[PDB]
């Protein structure tokens, strides 16, 4: 009659706290359930509903990263003593009066600052982060190199993965695999272009929560990477200014060589081929017309410039040569360096990145784009796209678009013709 079975392959959509598996800023020594191997259990005739924009895993990844980032800086040097009037000449070489280890004497010291880190007071400058936030110097021992982590379900939970390849980020998926842990995802911080992570299997896929709503970010996942060579050519030296009892400020000392602009080198042909595929897909998603790429109009750095974390330095690149193009040999993108970084759109906090002593060279992979549409009535048969959005959850949403977390509910009842003796 009523018979109970235990261990049935039944699940419900649910959220749960996830844990990860794999000195670094994202710890990684605590995230040491150590990854064995994936199980990839393919479920015959199982369909499921996925929605990358309602994915709780994205919200947890964002929360874990910010709490780790802040936890790692908790014991680091505060730079409060630097919010004094600076006497700046020429990047600027600035001097100031700072209390020394014995707090009755004051030293006159020198340090450089990049122009983007200082603001005129009205040669009289202050650090920009003296009226809105408390500036903390990151400890020189902390690596900012992304190390992939894998999100793992607790024992009573499982992660379903969508293997449809051309999945649009929302709706039914008819090829579902069950795993305990996700692929490794590098917590890369970037804007405008998506770096590293993972490429599409076949075609460039353009996803959007809604293509007619210009307030939503269009996420473009490439099926081929573009390699970018970023350099900060100056031959630096590091200087250390005591600011207290066992505490010091790391700054840049005299430049050994000549001053040269930071820049990134992208192959022109590779970029053109990348755009042709993007254009073909936008043409399919909208309604033929032409595609115009253009420059972002936000004006200010951080909003309109591409950003990278390269060796620990923060680059802002003027990616206009990549988008000033209408569709029916290298490109050199100049970059600026900034030391005071509001990573994550936080209020009341700021980080000072210590300078790096040597020459910096990075090689990164462009694996995607974050684009927005130019709204308004179209007056021709064209649509205009610009780099945009900038919400960091969009970066993580892209990497996690394939996963859903479900709760296993192994106990249940089914009919028969049975009675206990």
């Amino acid at each position, epitope marked *: 009659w009523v018979t109970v079975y235990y261990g049935v392959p039944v699940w419900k959509e649910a959220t749960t706290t996830l844990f990860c598996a794999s000195r670094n800023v994202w710890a990684t020594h605590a995230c040491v359930p150590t990854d064995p191997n994936p199980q990839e259990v393919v479920l015959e005739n199982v369909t499921e509903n996925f929605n990358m924009w309602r994915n709780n895993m994205v919200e947890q990844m964002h929360e874990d990263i910010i709490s780790l980032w802040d936890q790692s800086l908790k014991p680091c040097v505060k730079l409060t003593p630097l919010c004094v009037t600076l006497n700046c000449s020429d990047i600027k070489n600035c001097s100031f009066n700072i209390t020394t280890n014995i707090r009755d004497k004051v030293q006159k010291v020198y340090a450089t600052f990049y122009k983007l880190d200082i603001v005129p007071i009205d040669t009289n400058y202050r650090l920009i982060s003296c009226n809105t936030s408390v500036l903390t110097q990151a400890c020189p021992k902390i690596s900012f190199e992304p190390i992939p982590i894998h999100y793992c379900a607790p024992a009573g939970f499982a992660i379903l993965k969508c293997n449809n390849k051309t999945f649009n980020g929302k709706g039914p998926c008819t090829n579902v695999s069950t795993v305990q842990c996700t692929h490794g995802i590098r917590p890369v911080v970037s804007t405008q272009l998506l770096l590293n992570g993972s490429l599409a299997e076949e075609e460039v896929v353009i996803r959007s929560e809604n293509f007619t709503d210009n*307030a939503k970010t269009i996420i473009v996942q490439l099926n081929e990477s573009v390699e970018i060579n970023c350099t900060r050519p100056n031959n630096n030296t590091r200087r250390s200014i005591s600011i207290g009892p066992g505490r010091w400020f790391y700054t840049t000392g005299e430049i050994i060589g000549n001053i040269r602009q930071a820049h990134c080198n992208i192959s022109r042909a590779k970029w053109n081929n990348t755009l042709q595929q993007i254009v073909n897909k936008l043409r399919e998603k909208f309604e033929n017309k032409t595609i115009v790429f253009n420059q972002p109009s936000g004006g*200010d750095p951080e909003i309109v410039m591409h950003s990278f974390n390269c060796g620990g330095e923060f680059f802002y690149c003027n990616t206009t040569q990549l988008f000033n193009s209408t569709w029916n040999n290298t490109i050199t993108l100049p970059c600026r360096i900034k030391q005071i970084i509001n990573m994550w759109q936080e*209020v009341g906090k700021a980080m000072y990145a210590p300078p790096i002593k040597g020459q910096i060279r990075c090689s990164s992979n462009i694996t995607g784009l974050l684009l927005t*549409r130019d709204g308004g009535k179209t007056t021709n048969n064209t649509e205009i796209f610009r780099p945009g959005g900038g919400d960091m959850r969009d970066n993580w949403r892209s990497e996690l678009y394939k996963y859903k977390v479900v709760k296993i509910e192994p106990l249940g009842i089914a009919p028969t013709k049975c009675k206990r003796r």
Partner: antibody
Amino acid sequence: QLVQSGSGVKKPGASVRVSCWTSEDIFERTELIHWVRQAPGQGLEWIGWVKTVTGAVNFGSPDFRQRVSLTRDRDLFTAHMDIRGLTQGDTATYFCARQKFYTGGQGWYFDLWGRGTLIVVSS
Amino acid sequence: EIVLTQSPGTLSLSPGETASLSCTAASYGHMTWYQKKPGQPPKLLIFATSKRASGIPDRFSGSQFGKQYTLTITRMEPEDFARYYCQQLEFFGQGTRLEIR
């Protein structure tokens, strides 16, 4: 709610700085701050929006994209509209309004509107 | 523009009667409706085609008919003889008005 800058008169070619602001509780729950224009005798025209988190912007047409700078201040819980190159055709009441975080497909809808700043451009 | 044409332009109604306001789109996104009085900012009535904003009575409702979206105002009160507009994302319609018969 949504406190706004007062009205005034500008000569053609002048710039105007229109602003609005709110409480921490409202600003923190807003995804976008929109600006909407209403010329005397006309209906409503959308000008543009500013994301409160990233500072990203968008516009109703090139006639605004090339003249109107839209910004936000996340420490002060304010927003601004700087209109350069004012002409007589820009006489209108200018409203700020907010869009709460919403999912795609729900459409745009603005629960809260400011009172409207009146800008007159005249010789 | 060919999107969000509204009609009737002017509706001469008696108090207690029902207004019928139509907005036709060139595309299908959900429609949003507002009420306006001279000297005042508009008030949100309906959004996502049929949902109502807090503070809005059950006099106000709406629905979808393909690309046609409508707003119904029943048991109309004197306070409802206002200007109304439809919105579809970035566009607003011309607007219509209700007046006392």
